[PDB]
């Protein structure tokens, strides 16, 4: 799922999976 | 940023557990 381009809730919902109990930010204007 | 690296252009693993806390 990670290796291929992600965009708006795809990539957030990505980052959720992956980054599990640690949690994540999200800034898209950087 | 994230979309740059992730959107536009192809993400990995690597890049998104930058953006874990």
């Known amino acids: 799922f990670v290796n291929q381009h992600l965009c708006g809730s795809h990539l957030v919902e990505a980052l959720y999976l992956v980054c599990g109990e640690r949690g994540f930010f999200y800034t898209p204007k950087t | ?21």
């Open chain 2, 1 to 21: 940023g994230i979309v740059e690296q992730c959107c536009t252009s192809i993400c990995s693993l690597y890049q998104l557990e930058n953006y874990c806390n």
